[PDB]
Amino acid sequence: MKEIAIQEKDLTLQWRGNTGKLVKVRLKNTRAMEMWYNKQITEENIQEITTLNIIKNGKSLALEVYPEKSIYVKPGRINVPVFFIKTPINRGVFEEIFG
Amino acid sequence: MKEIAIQEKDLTLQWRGNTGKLVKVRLKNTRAMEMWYNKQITEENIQEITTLNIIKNGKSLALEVYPEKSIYVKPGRINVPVFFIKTPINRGVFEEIFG
Amino acid sequence: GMKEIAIQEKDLTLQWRGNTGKLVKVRLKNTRAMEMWYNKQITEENIQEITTLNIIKNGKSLALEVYPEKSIYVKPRINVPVFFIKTPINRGVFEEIFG
Amino acid sequence: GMKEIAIQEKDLTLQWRGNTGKLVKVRLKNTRAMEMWYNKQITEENIQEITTLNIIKNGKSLALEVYPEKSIYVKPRINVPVFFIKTPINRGVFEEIFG
């Protein structure tokens, strides 16, 4: 287990059908640049993460990912990390949590 | 020397007179929460940072800080890191850089 | 007869049944409501003349009929206009349109 | 004589001389301009009737005279209104007002 918290405002969320299951989350370009400088997530360490703790509106939601599926996608200038979400969660409850 | 990059959108900037010198930068509450979970900056490690690399609009600007002055301020729910900026930079040139 | 007013989506708080279902009502944001108050763009006397809201966003437009007899001002300094949506539209298709 | 229109600050791109000096001109953002186009709120035929913009933000308001004979549409899909500010105001005091 390795958990990283990421504020929701830094993620582009892909919901199946726009309203269904959360399929994947992609880091925004600016936050990705920042992480590159800091080595916060790297191509070499990305698959160590098993949980994303999504932060927003003073609330937090831990979501397991499929670590074998985590990848960098182009780009922007540099590639951005993408996580495939394993814990089932749908858009309605996600919106309810974060308000 | 220890440098940390932080995207501008996560900082509340205090400009002397609103237009003059950058005096200090305060992390936003949500990013502060995220950093708390990750231990990215902590009360124990904050004074190790000598440079902030401010990221925005695909651009980057390194600014030295006064490490002895870096502190947590309340709050929000938890305290937030504050850096006092040593490198002189005024609002006009900062705006020019970041556009 | 018909009276249509366009409002940019960013000026609306949208209420979706169950967060993902039918669009039930939209409420103007506080800043925009104050602007409309100074301009008399929408007023207590005229709000019920509006039969259609043309929602604008991302260079796209979606006309939606309202129930004019349900249009009301609600408490926020300034009360704000609320419209009850008559044209059936769900969150998925709305997100599809506007992206 | 006088004709005054309120516009929420978030719908304006403000041009400050030297980024920190006098406010020279404001241009409507693209989304708001498209809305105003559908509503005929401001039009090529009427734009030069406006003598004062009432800038709205953070529950506050600031009236600024314009040079009506300088008000023009510029290329962005849709051309957008631009006003040249006559009332002298600088970035510091403007930021002070609105915070």
UniProtKB/TrEMBL annotation, chains C, D:
Residues 2-99 form the Pheromone response PrgU-like domain. InterPro entries: Pheromone_resp_PrgU-like, PrgU-like_sf, PUA-like_sf. Keywords: Plasmid. The keyword 4Fe-4S does not apply. It holds the Pfam family PrgU. SUPFAM superfamilies: PUA domain-like (SSF88697). The keyword rRNA-binding does not apply. This is Pheromone response PrgU-like domain-containing protein. It comes from Enterococcus faecalis (strain ATCC 700802 / V583).
